[PDB]
């Protein structure tokens, strides 16, 4: 199966672009990153920073994760992110999303050797 690190890159990294430039970005990316094959994933965030910059977050401020686990890390700097939120009329298989671009601190859960992001927890 996909490694946890590779799954995080597929589901949450978009280093190719600095921001989402179209209101259809989430419709396109949720589909193209295989997040709508099994069901419409209701919410997902993509990070528009280099992989190195996101991996570096695992060496930044330790915080709790929303589920109460304690291996989360908050970025020192804000990062470009796109939040994808499923619309009210969305119905599988035509999963439809609202795209919101913002510049916020991110919180990721980190694991492994090398110690890298494995879950996207939150932004603030």
């Amino acid at each position, epitope marked *: 199966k996909e490694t946890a690190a590779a799954k995080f890159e597929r589901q949450h990294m978009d280093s190719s672009t600095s921001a989402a430039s179209s209101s259809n970005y989430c419709n396109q990316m949720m589909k193209s990153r295989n997040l709508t094959k099994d069901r419409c994933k209701p919410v997902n965030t993509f990070v528009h920073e280099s992989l190195a910059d996101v991996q570096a977050v*695992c*060496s930044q401020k*330790n*915080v*709790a994760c929303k589920n109460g*686990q*304690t*291996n989360c890390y908050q970025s020192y700097s804000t990062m470009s992110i796109t939040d994808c939120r499923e619309t009210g009329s969305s119905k599988y298989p035509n999963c439809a999303y609202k795209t919101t671009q913002a510049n916020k601190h991110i919180i990721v859960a*980190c*694991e492994g050797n090398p110690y890298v992001p494995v879950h996207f927890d939150a932004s603030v």
Partner: nanobody
Amino acid sequence: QVQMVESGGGLVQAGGSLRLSCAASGYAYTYIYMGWFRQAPGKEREGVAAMDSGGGGTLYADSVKGRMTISRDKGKNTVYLQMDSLKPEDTATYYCAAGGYELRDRTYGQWGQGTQVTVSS
């Protein structure tokens, strides 16, 4: 960049008490969890004890519970392991770890190099 230091091991005798000490420096925040893991020759690394920054959330491996005590300085990235009566089965390399959750090895991102404890019996 973070300096993880842990110490206190060496050649020791069955029945003795032993204290291992660990500290992180070069980190500008607080590690919520710190703990101790160990690996005996030819065996899997195993969790020994962990504790959170408030001095709670304490957990021990079943085979060491009641025989060793973890502690931490409040407000600090330090952790300690007080071993009450060394057994032969306690021979291992002991590692301190920081920044994870409970005794989940993969969740910890900072590790000391390990201090060898060899128990004679």
